[PDB]
Amino acid sequence: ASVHGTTYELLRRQGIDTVFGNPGSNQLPFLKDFPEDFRYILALQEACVVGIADGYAQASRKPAFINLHSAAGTGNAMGALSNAWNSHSPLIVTAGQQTRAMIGVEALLTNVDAANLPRPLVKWSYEPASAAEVPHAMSRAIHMASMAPQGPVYLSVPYDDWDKDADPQSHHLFDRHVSSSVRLNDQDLDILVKALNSASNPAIVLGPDVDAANANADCVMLAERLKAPVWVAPSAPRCPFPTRHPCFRGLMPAGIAAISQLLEGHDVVLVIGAPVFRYHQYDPGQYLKPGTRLISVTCDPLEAARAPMGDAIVADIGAMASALANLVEESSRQLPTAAPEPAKVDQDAGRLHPETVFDTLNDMAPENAIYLNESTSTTAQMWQRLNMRNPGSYYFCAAGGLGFALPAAIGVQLAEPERQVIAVIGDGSANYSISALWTAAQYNIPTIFVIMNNGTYGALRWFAGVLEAENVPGLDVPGIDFRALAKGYGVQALKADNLEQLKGSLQEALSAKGPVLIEVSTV
Amino acid sequence: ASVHGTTYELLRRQGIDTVFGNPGSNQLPFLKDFPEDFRYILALQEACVVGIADGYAQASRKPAFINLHSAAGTGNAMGALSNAWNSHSPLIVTAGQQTRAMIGVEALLTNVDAANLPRPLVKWSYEPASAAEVPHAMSRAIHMASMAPQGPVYLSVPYDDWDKDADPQSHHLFDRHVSSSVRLNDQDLDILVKALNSASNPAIVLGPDVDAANANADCVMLAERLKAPVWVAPSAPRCPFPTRHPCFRGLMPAGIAAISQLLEGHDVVLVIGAPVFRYHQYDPGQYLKPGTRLISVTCDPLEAARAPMGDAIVADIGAMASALANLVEESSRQLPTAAPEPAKVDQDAGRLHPETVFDTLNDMAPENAIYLNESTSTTAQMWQRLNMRNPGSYYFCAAGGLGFALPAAIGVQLAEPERQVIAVIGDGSANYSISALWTAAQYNIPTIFVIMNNGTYGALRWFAGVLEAENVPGLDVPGIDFRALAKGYGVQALKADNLEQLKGSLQEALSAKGPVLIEVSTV
Amino acid sequence: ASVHGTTYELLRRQGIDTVFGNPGSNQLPFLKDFPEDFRYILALQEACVVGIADGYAQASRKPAFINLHSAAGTGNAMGALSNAWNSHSPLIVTAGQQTRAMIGVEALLTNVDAANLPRPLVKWSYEPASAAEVPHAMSRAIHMASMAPQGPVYLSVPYDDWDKDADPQSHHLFDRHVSSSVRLNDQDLDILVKALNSASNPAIVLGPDVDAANANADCVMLAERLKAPVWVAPSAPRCPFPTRHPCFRGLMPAGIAAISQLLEGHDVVLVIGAPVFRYHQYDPGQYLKPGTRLISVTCDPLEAARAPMGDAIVADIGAMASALANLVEESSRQLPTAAPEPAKVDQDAGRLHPETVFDTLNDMAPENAIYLNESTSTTAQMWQRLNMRNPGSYYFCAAGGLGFALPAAIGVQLAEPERQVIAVIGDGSANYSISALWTAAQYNIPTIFVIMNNGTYGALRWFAGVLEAENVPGLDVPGIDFRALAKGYGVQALKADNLEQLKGSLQEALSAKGPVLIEVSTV
Numbered sequence A, B, C: 001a002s003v004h005g006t007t008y009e010l011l012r013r014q015g016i017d018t019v020f021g022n023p024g025s026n027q028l029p030f031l032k033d034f035p036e037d038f039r040y041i042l043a044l045q046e047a048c049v050v051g052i053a054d055g056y057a058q059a060s061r062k063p064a065f066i067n068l069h070s071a072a073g074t075g076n077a078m079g080a081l082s083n084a085w086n087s088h089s090p091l092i093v094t095a096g097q098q099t100r101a102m103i104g105v106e107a108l109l110t111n112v113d114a115a116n117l118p119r120p121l122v123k124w125s126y127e128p129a130s131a132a133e134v135p136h137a138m139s140r141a142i143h144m145a146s147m148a149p150q151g152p153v154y155l156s157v158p159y160d161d162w163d164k165d166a167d168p169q170s171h172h173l174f175d176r177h178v179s180s181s182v183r184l185n186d187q188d189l190d191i192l193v194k195a196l197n198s199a200s201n202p203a204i205v206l207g208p209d210v211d212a213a214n215a216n217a218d219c220v221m222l223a224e225r226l227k228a229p230v231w232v233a234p235s236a237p238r239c240p241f242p243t244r245h246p247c248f249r250g251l252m253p254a255g256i257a258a259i260s261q262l263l264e265g266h267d268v269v270l271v272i273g274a275p276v277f278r279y280h281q282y283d284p285g286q287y288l289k290p291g292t293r294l295i296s297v298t299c300d301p302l303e304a305a306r307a308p309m310g311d312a313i314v315a316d317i318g319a320m321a322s323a324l325a326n327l328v329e330e331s332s333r334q335l336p337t338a339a340p341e342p343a344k345v346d347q348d349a350g351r352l353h354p355e356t357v358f359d360t361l362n363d364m365a366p367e368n369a370i371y372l373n374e375s376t377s378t379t380a381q382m383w384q385r386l387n388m389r390n391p392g393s394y395y396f397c398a399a400g401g402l403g404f405a406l407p408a409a410i411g412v413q414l415a416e417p418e419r420q421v422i423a424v425i426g427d428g429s430a431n432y433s434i435s436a437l438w439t440a441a442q443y444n445i446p447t448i449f450v451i452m453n454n455g456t457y458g459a460l461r462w463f464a465g466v467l468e469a470e471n472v473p474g475l476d477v478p479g480i481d482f483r484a485l486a487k488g489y490g491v492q493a494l495k496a497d498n499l500e501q502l503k504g505s506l507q508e509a510l511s512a513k514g515p516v517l518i519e520v521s522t523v
């Protein structure tokens, strides 16, 4: 067998059947004779390729396979890899390299020092020393991306390797099963359970790795048993809990002092599947108030090591959440009371308040909709206004890197064909990965894109104001016609200049048979 | 003085007056109080920021200054940095980092292991250990980008550094002059001159560093004195010679055997300002035929080290070209005869042959036009059909990385307001950095964009055919309306479905007062 | 031909005939059939291998070739590479890697991520992608080490590559000549010369790259013409000037304020072949006083970029020193007056003052002796007390890394068999690379080793005192018998407990036919 045939058999045997890619000459020997049981998803720029694959992997809860062109193509994707790193997304990034005979002279398209290019944004990065090693290296990449803590990996392959003979002993790779589905030993788990049972006023904080693990329902049981309020850890990449469950208390503010104040009076705070903590704004103060003990369960040694406070347990989130939820006592305390509905903001017949948009989406969208957020000034309101009952219902760029939601919404919709995806994207954010719209059109992936058009980088104008920073250039983005962009890439386009038009446009979009972009004029 | 004030004074004193950027919160303390004597050029995605800056630096023959957001923004620009590395472009890439107080906890927007992120695509990469070091680090960045061999550099700056007190001893940085304008010592230069004078059938090969140095006219004198044919080194990023001068022989094919065959019979081949050689296709054979000696003059030790044949001299291209041109004897041999004009391809009243497009551009464009090429299947024809008399007249992605020409054409036009820039970009290539069109519209930079629309990644379809590679996915890009994209970003748009319309559209574009996109239907 | 045969032919054709090594199984396919025209120099630990090679390269003014075992052997040498980096030593470090078939599984002796291991202490670091590339990679290594600024390079080679067939086109590598022997263009050089001629009170500062270039005599002519005092730049790795020439003013103190004070009143300071500056102690103040302009000539862009003051010219030191010395005018000013002899320190009949030792060495040693210094508390006195008339007469660990002088003195003595080498090494320093003594014994390289035994890390005890740092552990090294160590490795050993014995021992050592160690009891 050839390296080509052995590698595709390994991929198939390991559950991979889709290649997200943008092609190039160093990849042609890999992409030729493309197997009939595989699907190729083309995107027009590599940030878009990797964003689509990322949304696919996060929603599917399985690795996604990517194939890129050399250094330039890998490079174009590195902002996307920054997000994937922070979301623990299991991405297998392969890049075509020059033929081994031409690497030394640094022919055009040579990926120089290739394994160093994506660092520090990958778990493992490698170029094999020979063609026959390529299947083994691919095996390593699959497992490295897939073991807890999941994350992106990189493999560079010289184009002449594919046609070479494989090692027949590569067959041992095909059916390897590698597990990291582990939890704290029984003795220490009993100690933790007792501490949770003995707490007088526990709180729970959940992060994205809960949703990635589909540990959401177990965390609901845990919260119900402990009669504990539940917060989502700051800068949330995913939604780990039903947002109208009585225990839910919303998104934590991303500040040191704000979080210790919020946690004051809680004697034990159990954090599951989050860094401690993904702060953002400078908000100096105490990490915890006196009287609060924190215990973190994390899938990631790097998270456990850098927490500035608390104990930690490094384990699989699914396994730990299931064990805790089934072992804790049912507390006698009263169940927390649900948060009240948010206020309806006054809305005239002109430009839309973001609150209006989110209320309307919540009114009209299916109960199993999936939302993506890249409308950076409106996140707090979005989290208050969307009832998200189900797992997998929310994604936000985990490193704060714009250009994620537009392509990722396409990959999420590919992963979840029965669940309507609605991406709420600011006018600034929409440009970073605008060409991803074409993939939605070509493959008829029926994502709805809601462009929040306020003409500015609003979150940055806001922050300049908190700073009292004068004379800051580059904060306004006037003069973009998003309906024309949508037409450019073959996506149906609508405008919404007022609430009547927003409702009309959403109605049209929700019944459409293809992707739709709605440009919304916001305040 | 603050670090902010000292740093802007250093930039001004070192000739920097423009910041190419996409803003972000870790940059706000740098961008506030933006000096009135500086210009900010906003682009919507970082590949576009860096591409614009790259074209500006290459055309201006001076460093360009860039300011990006953290890891994600830097990451989005890394495909652009791959090209900048290969073109020796003097780019000072700065990226805003989190406040020093928040780096340890890896708050959102922390650039982790920041100095490693852009490697291996930068000459120097650094994060200062303290705020007061930032001006010195910025000095290092300026000089590292600017010394031969020029290239991109990276500096990460924590946002809290700018407001801190600077070292008063930083004033010594302001007026430093650093020269690498060096040439071979007289004894060894005399040996080289004698070898050139004694050659019976010399040839000259020129690369991009000749154009970067504005050594073009000196190379013309050299070629005239030696009565030698002149070739452009393969995979040419720039045009180093007048393309209708009698000595000019065109673009070398990017293959080992093709180049040795071309050079057969030439006893001495002098290569100036090129790698030896930027081959592309696999074309095995002899690096040189018996009877040919090669001598390379290069600004880059890495080029000299990796050449598989020939002697080398590592020196400044401007200084070496001027010395050689003034020292060699006038040979008695007959001057080479000019290449004949290329053939006119038969053209009906339907879709345009690329040859037609280039002939028409050559007919209608000003004699001092500047061309950019990202129409990958048509490069050989473009090089044959455009009379480029002047330096600075041609740019092509130096690493082969698509997404360069659209933004770079905007930066070149900003650098050369009196010279009409015409970017010839394939329909595939146009998408990589499509959002750069907005910067042309906003700043009214009157670049002309000619989109060669054949519906496919033609160069890859071609190569799959040479390979006899069947069943390759992802090679077609149907369904893109480039006039709608242009409208989306505020750029006037025209179509050309036949030759009559191409001429009409070019006439309109050439007299327009702003940027114009022409979608051309090509065969 | 095999890769083995082609590689040894390349080495021979490029002037390499000696391999400094410590063997291992991944190197056996390289070291077998060792050519009869090559010499192998074995040392017992890799710090010693690289130190010997370093002294050989620095004294010989040519690259030295090293062959080490995998990651562990490379690792053992990395302190030695820190010094080699700072001295610009042209070292070709090769390391044997596992067979390509075993790298993926990470068999014992695999050098994982090999090219990253020696970074950041090498100019270039690489592992070839195929066996046939190894000769080309070796060519790259030779030239990268040898081009200005010279320095160490690293090449990892899988053991199975050597027996494979080489590319016949590798013959083009054999006779490549690569020059970086360049100097400032004539126009700008004339500007510099005029500034030097117009100076009212010039000073000259010289660094190690002057001695490396054998530019010493040209600098003497320069100093004589300009009637200028001459200082050696701080932390001096080499001696660039005759130390009793009338212009010589000694070693600069390694402090910012001390150097600006020393330079006060000098209107133009010309620095040649040094960083600006290799300060050590924290001595804050002005980098230059008002009235002083600095101009640096450096072979290293990294030096030019980081200087905090002054103009710079990046060029070959030999070429620049020769041009300046022949172009400047003879000033009418009076030649500087020689420094007076230093004082004789009072010495009783007990333990030796270091000053006594250096005076006695100066009295008894040949006029063409070569000294090495790793007696860290006595450097200032050594520089005052040794008359070093000739180039190549002094070496000191260029990064401050102990373990250099003992092995380097063996490599210097191998390079300069007619010049008696005398290494003055503290009792602390002597241990770092003690096993290098064996190589001197085995090859009968007649280095003299003078161990300054004061029982302590004296320089650190001194510094703790300037700090008023109490309760510092680990500063004393009692209980080492250096005569027994010398016997252990087969080197003749003497003691000197007083001046009479020092003179007797030096007399014996100077007439010995092999290496000799003298343990001196110092105060």
Ligand SMILES: Cc1ncc(Cn2c(C)c(CCOP(=O)(O)OP(=O)(O)O)sc2=O)c(N)n1
Pocket (backbone or CB within 6 Å): A079, A374, A375, A376, A377, A378, A400, A401, A402, A403, A425, A426, A427, A428, A429, A430, A432, A454, A456, A457, A458, A459, A460, B022, B023, B024, B025, B069, B072, B073, B076
């Ligand atoms: C890749 C990248 N570049 C730049 C930024 C900096 N940035 C920018 C540019 C923001 C404004 C986004 O504007 P928008 O129109 O999408 O949304 P709002 O108007 O609601 O802020 S928010 C933010 O952090 C970023 N996060 N990621």
Ligand SMILES: Cc1ncc(Cn2c(C)c(CCOP(=O)(O)OP(=O)(O)O)sc2=O)c(N)n1
Pocket (backbone or CB within 6 Å): A022, A023, A024, A025, A069, A072, A073, A076, B079, B374, B375, B376, B377, B378, B400, B401, B402, B403, B425, B426, B427, B428, B429, B430, B432, B454, B456, B457, B458, B459, B460
């Ligand atoms: C960033 C990036 N991604 C992918 C490629 C691979 N690639 C691709 C995708 C090419 C086709 C460009 O198509 P085009 O429409 O611009 O021009 P032609 O139809 O004339 O080939 S040429 C080429 O090398 C690349 N060079 N750079």
Ligand SMILES: Cc1ncc(Cn2c(C)c(CCOP(=O)(O)OP(=O)(O)O)sc2=O)c(N)n1
Pocket (backbone or CB within 6 Å): C079, C374, C375, C376, C377, C378, C400, C401, C402, C403, C425, C426, C427, C428, C429, C430, C432, C454, C456, C457, C458, C459, C460
């Ligand atoms: C490899 C290494 N380790 C530790 C040190 C630190 N160090 C040490 C350990 C010194 C004392 C050397 O003691 P010595 O006996 O050789 O000489 P003195 O007694 O004259 O200081 S000087 C110095 O910087 C070093 N420079 N290099």
Ligand SMILES: [Ca+2]
Pocket (backbone or CB within 6 Å): A359, A362, A363
């Ligand atoms: Ca409602």
Ligand SMILES: [Ca+2]
Pocket (backbone or CB within 6 Å): A060, A414, A415, A416, A417
């Ligand atoms: Ca699915």
Ligand SMILES: [Ca+2]
Pocket (backbone or CB within 6 Å): A426, A427, A428, A452, A453, A454, A455, A456, A457, A458
């Ligand atoms: Ca906005």
Ligand SMILES: [Ca+2]
Pocket (backbone or CB within 6 Å): B359, B362, B363
């Ligand atoms: Ca014509």
Ligand SMILES: [Ca+2]
Pocket (backbone or CB within 6 Å): B060, B414, B415, B416, B417
């Ligand atoms: Ca200009």
Ligand SMILES: [Ca+2]
Pocket (backbone or CB within 6 Å): B426, B427, B428, B452, B453, B454, B455, B456, B457, B458
């Ligand atoms: Ca095309």
Ligand SMILES: [Ca+2]
Pocket (backbone or CB within 6 Å): C359, C362, C363
């Ligand atoms: Ca004396």
Ligand SMILES: [Ca+2]
Pocket (backbone or CB within 6 Å): C060, C414, C415, C416, C417
């Ligand atoms: Ca010798």
Ligand SMILES: [Ca+2]
Pocket (backbone or CB within 6 Å): C426, C427, C428, C452, C453, C454, C455, C456, C457, C458
């Ligand atoms: Ca001592």
Ligand SMILES: [Mg+2]
Pocket (backbone or CB within 6 Å): A116, A117, A118, A119, A120, B116, B117, B118, B119, B120
């Ligand atoms: Mg990197």
Ligand SMILES: [Mg+2]
Pocket (backbone or CB within 6 Å): C116, C117, C118, C119, C120
């Ligand atoms: Mg290392």
